Amino acid sequence: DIVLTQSPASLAVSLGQPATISCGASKSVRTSGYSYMDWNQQKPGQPPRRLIYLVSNLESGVPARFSGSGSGTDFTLNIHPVEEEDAATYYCSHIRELPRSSGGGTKLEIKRADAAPTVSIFPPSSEQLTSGGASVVCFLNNFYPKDINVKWKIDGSERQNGVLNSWTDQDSKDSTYSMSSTLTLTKDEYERHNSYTCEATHKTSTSPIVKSFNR
Amino acid sequence: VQLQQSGAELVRSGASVKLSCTASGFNIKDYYMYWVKLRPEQGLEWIGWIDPENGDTEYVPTFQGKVTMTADTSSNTAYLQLSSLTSEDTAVYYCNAGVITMAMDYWGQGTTVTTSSAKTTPPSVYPLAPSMVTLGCLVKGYFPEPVTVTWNSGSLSSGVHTFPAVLQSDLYTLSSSVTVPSSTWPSQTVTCNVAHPASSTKVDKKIVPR
């Protein structure tokens, strides 16, 4: 099969600036006639979409801003200017030989003005305590960039087991990310402590944002 | 102008399942229906095609004897049967009506197949109460995925954050935030709706102050 080598793996661009991704075929993707090279894009949690077929032909719907180029072993996809709604994973796909083959992906981040997470902490609810579990939920919304570190303190001691984190994909519309962190204990260990603290360390403030409650 | 694929599937290690992909606004003998596997935090694998005009099929060597493509050009539907399932078959499966003419192209919204020998467990829905203000609900310990959270039955959607389910204890846990102006609440009820088709459960939950 043909190894398709997408470069780079990751790409962060400001709105309005240009963008270019590369694709290398380990063989020429020109049959006898035209060259069956395609580009797709998967906007976050959406089926993939085909942008470009046959190296250069724009697929109905794609804006004039996109264009792809190449021949034989080398191909690139161009954007310029870049916009919010281009956030996605780009794939080069070849059809010159069965089995047809796919690049590894190129992940497109919109780079924007840094923004700090809006944070809130939520004590376990009564309804849950009655059942034996206790979960402290901390929401960390609308921040940029993605890399963010979250830390839980129970009565002043760092705590590491029980914490599950989950990130949304980059928001096509406002270009921020968002995060849940969730400290799950047992009702008795929850009752044994007093102070619960969720601390966001991000590139924004120096020291963390820290939401908290007592009891 | 839509391909619709069938709903999410949970099925046992060993069984078979059948995925459907139904067109509207074109006929599927004008295209090749392709199938494409997306393992979560990995690449698209191509599985092959069916030409619903001669019922020709071609599978990729990795999927032969694992995969059966069929098509019903009478109800304009394309089929992908997967056989003797394994953990490696846990993925999302898209059908693509696609053809280079001598073009134009459609994608289905995809079908999530989950290979587990575990059991349907409905969620527990927990309320999350504290310019503007943030509210949420916690959806804990259900199985399989998905669940869906809307807010006030869809009317609220602006400033809703809803996170990918995470696996732990062999069930999923997720949650949703919604941020409203603190005049709107609690002066006006904020409710979160939770659908778990797999257990046929629906939960409305009001966010009252503590």
Partner: peptide, 10 residues
Amino acid sequence: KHPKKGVEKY
């Protein structure tokens, strides 16, 4: 001419 198999149609 002749449409590449699996890929192109008249």
